[PDB]
Amino acid sequence: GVEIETISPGDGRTFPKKGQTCVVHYTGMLQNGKKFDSSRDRNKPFKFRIGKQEVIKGFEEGAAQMSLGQRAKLTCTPDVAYGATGHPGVIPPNATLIFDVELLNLE
Template identity: 55%
Template structure:
């Protein structure tokens, strides 16, 4: 994956590529996950992942810091990236009292989940697919299914299947 330097005050480092087809444009409503940390010491100051509630906003409308408006527009749907943002494109000389110190450079791990109604769908791994299927089956049935596979006849031998005539 590469690092794209957008301006002297920020860069985007791709962790996981997106679809490479759908990119946000000004005015699009985006849905994202993010974790924000201070570049100086890695202290986390905010995260949408803590409560598993994605963040929704309109890109290019000034609803987020400049570093997001610039950096996120370079990401494609489904992409996971690291935004390195200097204070000039974040919260400036003042910071955010109690959360972000003055002149703090920030690092955001971001994931672009949706652009408008277009949601990124990736192929699940075998483990993820099994977990998804298991989530639909009541736990007592899952336990019974695994126990049924291990059942033996009362004398400890395996049951023999009856032959059909």
């Protein structure tokens, strides 16, 4: 269960395929509206190796749908997120997450 709303469309023809890493600037927020994670504060692109499941499932399968240069808003359910165990001291248990993902480039 994931919902993706476009904030600003990008290309729409180059989609993230297996073999090339995906380079993003995301901004994760809790459902109450309290930001918990971002990449622009660290001021470094978050390059994650798509297909190897090293990131959370919701982010992984929501990044596939959106294309290059697209600012997209996600909504990851706890099932596709950390769930009942949650993240210790960061994310409360059984929480729905929202991500302001932007894939500025594929490598």
